[PDB]
Design an enzyme around this catalytic site. Sequence first.
Site, PDB file in Angstrom:
ATOM      1  N   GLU A  46      27.269  -6.271  38.960  1.00 46.22           N
ATOM      2  CA  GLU A  46      27.838  -5.977  40.265  1.00 46.22           C
ATOM      3  C   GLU A  46      29.092  -5.098  40.214  1.00 46.22           C
ATOM      4  O   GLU A  46      29.808  -4.992  41.189  1.00 46.22           O
ATOM      5  CB  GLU A  46      28.090  -7.291  41.016  1.00 46.22           C
ATOM      6  CG  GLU A  46      26.793  -8.026  41.342  1.00 46.22           C
ATOM      7  CD  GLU A  46      26.995  -9.185  42.278  1.00 46.22           C
ATOM      8  OE1 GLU A  46      28.168  -9.468  42.603  1.00 46.22           O
ATOM      9  OE2 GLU A  46      25.983  -9.807  42.694  1.00 46.22           O
ATOM     10  N   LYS A  87      30.264  -9.652  51.131  1.00 42.04           N
ATOM     11  CA  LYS A  87      30.403  -9.335  49.739  1.00 42.04           C
ATOM     12  C   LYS A  87      29.291  -8.386  49.350  1.00 42.04           C
ATOM     13  O   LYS A  87      28.103  -8.600  49.638  1.00 42.04           O
ATOM     14  CB  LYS A  87      30.482 -10.571  48.824  1.00 42.04           C
ATOM     15  CG  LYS A  87      29.244 -11.408  48.714  1.00 42.04           C
ATOM     16  CD  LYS A  87      29.399 -12.454  47.566  1.00 42.04           C
ATOM     17  CE  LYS A  87      28.051 -12.878  47.034  1.00 42.04           C
ATOM     18  NZ  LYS A  87      28.235 -14.149  46.182  1.00 42.04           N
ATOM     19  N   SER A  94      20.264 -14.857  39.976  1.00 41.93           N
ATOM     20  CA  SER A  94      20.514 -16.285  40.150  1.00 41.93           C
ATOM     21  C   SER A  94      19.909 -16.715  41.494  1.00 41.93           C
ATOM     22  O   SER A  94      20.599 -16.833  42.497  1.00 41.93           O
ATOM     23  CB  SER A  94      22.009 -16.609  40.008  1.00 41.93           C
ATOM     24  OG  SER A  94      22.807 -16.104  41.067  1.00 41.93           O
ATOM     25  N   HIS A 122      25.031 -12.409  35.483  1.00 40.66           N
ATOM     26  CA  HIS A 122      25.319 -10.982  35.812  1.00 40.66           C
ATOM     27  C   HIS A 122      26.119 -10.231  34.738  1.00 40.66           C
ATOM     28  O   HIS A 122      26.441  -9.031  34.922  1.00 40.66           O
ATOM     29  CB  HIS A 122      26.133 -10.862  37.101  1.00 40.66           C
ATOM     30  CG  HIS A 122      25.495 -11.472  38.315  1.00 40.66           C
ATOM     31  ND1 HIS A 122      26.179 -11.598  39.508  1.00 40.66           N
ATOM     32  CD2 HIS A 122      24.256 -11.981  38.533  1.00 40.66           C
ATOM     33  CE1 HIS A 122      25.392 -12.163  40.406  1.00 40.66           C
ATOM     34  NE2 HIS A 122      24.223 -12.413  39.840  1.00 40.66           N
ATOM     35  N   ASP A 179      24.858 -20.896  49.547  1.00 39.04           N
ATOM     36  CA  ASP A 179      24.038 -19.735  49.214  1.00 39.04           C
ATOM     37  C   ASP A 179      22.657 -20.213  48.719  1.00 39.04           C
ATOM     38  O   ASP A 179      21.654 -20.105  49.443  1.00 39.04           O
ATOM     39  CB  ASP A 179      24.741 -18.812  48.195  1.00 39.04           C
ATOM     40  CG  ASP A 179      23.789 -17.781  47.609  1.00 39.04           C
ATOM     41  OD1 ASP A 179      22.884 -17.339  48.348  1.00 39.04           O
ATOM     42  OD2 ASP A 179      23.927 -17.424  46.416  1.00 39.04           O
ATOM     43  N   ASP A 184      32.361 -17.373  43.560  1.00 43.31           N
ATOM     44  CA  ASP A 184      30.984 -17.879  43.606  1.00 43.31           C
ATOM     45  C   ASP A 184      30.669 -18.504  42.260  1.00 43.31           C
ATOM     46  O   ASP A 184      30.476 -17.801  41.291  1.00 43.31           O
ATOM     47  CB  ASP A 184      29.962 -16.763  43.909  1.00 43.31           C
ATOM     48  CG  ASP A 184      28.533 -17.276  43.982  1.00 43.31           C
ATOM     49  OD1 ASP A 184      28.240 -18.468  43.759  1.00 43.31           O
ATOM     50  OD2 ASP A 184      27.659 -16.474  44.234  1.00 43.31           O
ATOM     51  N   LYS A 194      21.546 -13.588  53.167  1.00 42.32           N
ATOM     52  CA  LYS A 194      20.767 -12.722  52.280  1.00 42.32           C
ATOM     53  C   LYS A 194      19.420 -12.546  52.975  1.00 42.32           C
ATOM     54  O   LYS A 194      18.568 -13.465  53.015  1.00 42.32           O
ATOM     55  CB  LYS A 194      20.584 -13.372  50.919  1.00 42.32           C
ATOM     56  CG  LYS A 194      21.757 -13.176  49.967  1.00 42.32           C
ATOM     57  CD  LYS A 194      21.648 -14.145  48.798  1.00 42.32           C
ATOM     58  CE  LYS A 194      22.626 -13.740  47.672  1.00 42.32           C
ATOM     59  NZ  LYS A 194      22.678 -14.842  46.671  1.00 42.32           N
ATOM     60  N   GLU A 196      31.938 -20.337  46.926  1.00 47.25           N
ATOM     61  CA  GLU A 196      30.506 -20.352  47.135  1.00 47.25           C
ATOM     62  C   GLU A 196      29.770 -21.189  46.059  1.00 47.25           C
ATOM     63  O   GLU A 196      30.136 -21.177  44.873  1.00 47.25           O
ATOM     64  CB  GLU A 196      29.995 -18.920  47.179  1.00 47.25           C
ATOM     65  CG  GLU A 196      28.544 -18.785  47.431  1.00 47.25           C
ATOM     66  CD  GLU A 196      28.096 -17.349  47.264  1.00 47.25           C
ATOM     67  OE1 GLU A 196      28.912 -16.427  47.554  1.00 47.25           O
ATOM     68  OE2 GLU A 196      26.937 -17.151  46.819  1.00 47.25           O
ATOM     69  N   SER A 226      25.608 -10.778  52.539  1.00 43.21           N
ATOM     70  CA  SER A 226      25.598 -10.502  51.093  1.00 43.21           C
ATOM     71  C   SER A 226      24.515  -9.528  50.579  1.00 43.21           C
ATOM     72  O   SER A 226      23.382  -9.502  51.057  1.00 43.21           O
ATOM     73  CB  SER A 226      25.529 -11.828  50.293  1.00 43.21           C
ATOM     74  OG  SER A 226      25.435 -11.619  48.881  1.00 43.21           O
ATOM     75  N   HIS A 227      24.906  -8.781  49.548  1.00 40.96           N
ATOM     76  CA  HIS A 227      23.964  -8.113  48.634  1.00 40.96           C
ATOM     77  C   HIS A 227      23.237  -9.113  47.722  1.00 40.96           C
ATOM     78  O   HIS A 227      23.491 -10.343  47.778  1.00 40.96           O
ATOM     79  CB  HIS A 227      24.753  -7.111  47.805  1.00 40.96           C
ATOM     80  CG  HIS A 227      25.772  -7.745  46.902  1.00 40.96           C
ATOM     81  ND1 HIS A 227      26.417  -7.038  45.915  1.00 40.96           N
ATOM     82  CD2 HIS A 227      26.306  -8.995  46.875  1.00 40.96           C
ATOM     83  CE1 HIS A 227      27.287  -7.825  45.299  1.00 40.96           C
ATOM     84  NE2 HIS A 227      27.248  -9.021  45.872  1.00 40.96           N
ATOM     85  N   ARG A 228      22.351  -8.591  46.874  1.00 40.68           N
ATOM     86  CA  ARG A 228      21.834  -9.295  45.712  1.00 40.68           C
ATOM     87  C   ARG A 228      22.376  -8.639  44.464  1.00 40.68           C
ATOM     88  O   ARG A 228      22.874  -7.534  44.515  1.00 40.68           O
ATOM     89  CB  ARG A 228      20.297  -9.235  45.653  1.00 40.68           C
ATOM     90  CG  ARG A 228      19.570  -9.864  46.796  1.00 40.68           C
ATOM     91  CD  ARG A 228      20.077 -11.249  47.189  1.00 40.68           C
ATOM     92  NE  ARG A 228      20.008 -12.272  46.137  1.00 40.68           N
ATOM     93  CZ  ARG A 228      19.192 -13.332  46.151  1.00 40.68           C
ATOM     94  NH1 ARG A 228      18.301 -13.477  47.131  1.00 40.68           N
ATOM     95  NH2 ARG A 228      19.245 -14.249  45.159  1.00 40.68           N
ATOM     96  N   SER A 229      22.252  -9.287  43.319  1.00 41.83           N
ATOM     97  CA  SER A 229      22.794  -8.655  42.111  1.00 41.83           C
ATOM     98  C   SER A 229      21.949  -7.472  41.657  1.00 41.83           C
ATOM     99  O   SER A 229      22.447  -6.599  40.937  1.00 41.83           O
ATOM    100  CB  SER A 229      22.984  -9.652  40.972  1.00 41.83           C
ATOM    101  OG  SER A 229      21.735 -10.215  40.602  1.00 41.83           O
ATOM    102  N   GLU A 241      31.111 -15.365  39.855  1.00 41.21           N
ATOM    103  CA  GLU A 241      31.837 -14.356  40.632  1.00 41.21           C
ATOM    104  C   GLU A 241      33.266 -14.743  40.863  1.00 41.21           C
ATOM    105  O   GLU A 241      33.545 -15.831  41.358  1.00 41.21           O
ATOM    106  CB  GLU A 241      31.145 -14.060  41.977  1.00 41.21           C
ATOM    107  CG  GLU A 241      29.645 -13.748  41.823  1.00 41.21           C
ATOM    108  CD  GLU A 241      28.943 -13.414  43.114  1.00 41.21           C
ATOM    109  OE1 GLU A 241      29.632 -13.170  44.143  1.00 41.21           O
ATOM    110  OE2 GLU A 241      27.683 -13.381  43.080  1.00 41.21           O
TER     111      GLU A 241
HETATM  112 ZN   LIG Z   1      22.431 -16.303  43.144  1.00 42.48          ZN
HETATM  113 ZN   LIG Z   2      25.754 -16.823  45.305  1.00 47.88          ZN
END
Ligand SMILES: [Zn+2]
Ligand SMILES: [Zn+2]
Lengths: 431, 431
Positions: A210, A396, A42, A158, A320, A245, A345, A293, A372-375, A167
């Site tokens: 995730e 996260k 996303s 996801h 984000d 999120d 990110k 988010e 943050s991570h990414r998916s 999320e």
């Molecule tokens: Zn995204």
């Molecule tokens: Zn996000």
Amino acid sequence: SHMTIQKVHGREVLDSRGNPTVEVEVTTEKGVFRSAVPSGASTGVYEACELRDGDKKRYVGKGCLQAVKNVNEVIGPALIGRDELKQEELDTLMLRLDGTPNKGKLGANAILGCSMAISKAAAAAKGVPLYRYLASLAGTKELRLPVPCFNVINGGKHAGNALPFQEFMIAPVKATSFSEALRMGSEVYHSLRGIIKKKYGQDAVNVGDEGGFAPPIKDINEPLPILMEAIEEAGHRGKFAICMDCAASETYDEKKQQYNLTFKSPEPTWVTAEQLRETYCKWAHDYPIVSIEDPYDQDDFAGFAGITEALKGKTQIVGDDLTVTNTERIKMAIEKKACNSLLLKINQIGTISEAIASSKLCMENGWSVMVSHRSGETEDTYIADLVVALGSGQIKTGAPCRGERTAKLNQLLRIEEELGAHAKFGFPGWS
Amino acid sequence: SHMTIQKVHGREVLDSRGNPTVEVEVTTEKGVFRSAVPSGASTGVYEACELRDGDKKRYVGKGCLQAVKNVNEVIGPALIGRDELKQEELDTLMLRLDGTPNKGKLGANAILGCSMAISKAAAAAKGVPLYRYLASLAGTKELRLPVPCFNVINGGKHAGNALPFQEFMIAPVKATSFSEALRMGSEVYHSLRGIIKKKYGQDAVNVGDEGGFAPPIKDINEPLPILMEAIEEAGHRGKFAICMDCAASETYDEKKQQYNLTFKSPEPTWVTAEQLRETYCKWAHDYPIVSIEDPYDQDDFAGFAGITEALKGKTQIVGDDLTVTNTERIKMAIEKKACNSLLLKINQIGTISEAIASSKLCMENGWSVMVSHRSGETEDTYIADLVVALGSGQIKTGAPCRGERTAKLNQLLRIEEELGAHAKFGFPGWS
Ligand SMILES: [Zn+2]
Ligand SMILES: [Zn+2]
Ligand SMILES: [Zn+2]
Ligand SMILES: [Zn+2]
């Protein structure tokens, strides 16, 4: 004198969804320093360029051979013999080597892994762990272990379900150490599996990108009672907050100016933003919802602003896709009081120097920062050292499930242990 | 003289299911060498002891604090000042320190991470990568990159579905390099998602413990056509073989002497072993089924033998719960010609020295060796170097999905690159 960058080498590796990504090794006399680039599903439209090959014969167009070539033939040769300690100088060289606003020539994915690995090589030259090195670069006065925000029910892009929002997170805000936070998170996660399986059956307990459960849920309100029940059953009543999120851009139709809450289903469910705000204010009164988010489309600065003020003090609103870790977009968010928290990110912007500047800008204006991570993640653990170095108190990085999530949590255990029992834990405003 | 083990330290970390496991660091002058222990779900009764705390207040009894304490207070202090090059000597010290046949005093989980990390520290002292060091220890004449066996539809104890048998694998046996094998695997995996989603819907494409899809399938025959369709659609017709792990012990009832093919369902489906063999012979004629693991109960040496001979030359039969990487159990399998392939799981036996002895015993008697992960994995990549070092040509380490699986595959890309285009790939008997 022999203390410079000796070798730079890129390769194509797989991410946690099995898609190619870029990894970079910077070799110095102190060792081989390796950094891999994550990838979103996303992705905001304002994200720096992730460069893919488009060869339908390899990974149906998703190869990163061109980005790897740019590392190997353009960026690498320019870094050999350079002083890895000069983070900003080298990051700026790489920006100029690209020469475009979005890193569309070389790729943010080619540049970022170089940026990252340079900082690892530098930390090593300084004789300090990565988190210590980055905290000096960021001018951080106080290290802290963050509260992890565990995406434990997965939806949107996801997960294989009707659930439109992305999320649903639990955050052990009342833990007093990262150790306890991680265990409490895991414990509620295990209780949650039993609750979901009893309610939706066996087929409901498989996992999303995730590591969160992907139950057969359509309704955006339905996860919340299930989270509270899980928290309670694990023995942790009173100890947790919820983080959301919505990733609402993924549901937004610009031509209709509405949000489809059933976009992964045959029939559409159109919803106004004023019907979205009704829902958010109701979340915040009903549940310990401390963070939301991307509650709106990535260009709806007005919706963002309205909900940031209606929820001031109860619930932080996180840019984000709104902010994309970019000081230009941040400056617009500041000006319109669009939000009060940054999702940081590194690969939304593409250099370590820029990501750090983004964090300092946001914290100077009074926002929080959730690293943050990414998916699409890898075994890379950079963001663990990064969140500690920035002293922000929020990360996260997934459910406590799937190695590309647990690798970060485990790295946080290691940093914790290094810093000792006097090390600060948590987000003070949530504790 | 200052070239000895300086420090040994254990800690509790999380595995890919979010359960505690043991990680060990051996510190020498050459660095900090870190090895984490995996954990099975479908564990044979003959496996070396995995030591858990049983404190229902931490991780509902699954803590590894006692194993960590045994590392820190018993094993560690004994290794300080010792020459890490002496693998067999140190492994044997640790066996004697335990003093029990199953490692039930100290724990196979306490011992194994020490064993592993010692060998990393040693490779470093020798100035060679781990795979090179282990190949000298194993006396391997020829390194090879293995064909990966990708568990892409998950069932049994690893997945939320009715599916009784555990693993349905695809293996790109006709690739000519590990690079190509990994990409082909990923490509078929991506085609498979579309096929499953079209057939079973959206909710069917979420993942099991090992990264495979967990569709709503009950019937053990049903995955096979779906695998063939995926192979074809990706453009890879003719290039793949199928590998099965039934993990049949998980379905076996000793009192009834039958197999329940619906043990995760309300009503039972009882099946004789003679009805299981009908199915296996039918698999082998119908599909390019080159491997079948644990087709029977872990103590059914007779069933094992019967199917090893009826499928000789077409289909290797893999002892996993049968053999538990243990030379005593292997010797019984050899004597009864029970199987012709070893699933090598370092944590089924608990030392590197023993796991290597198991590999040499089996290959000296003409079996193949498939190095394996556990279903509870970590970011650790030891088994990548291990399979290369043993020169066996076979690894199963998951679907190309989930970082605790992709970490191993990526490590195999790195080893590949180090060895150059002359490096051998694959299992010769399948190529
Ligand atoms: Zn995204
Ligand atoms: Zn996000
Ligand atoms: Zn098993
Ligand atoms: Zn098995």
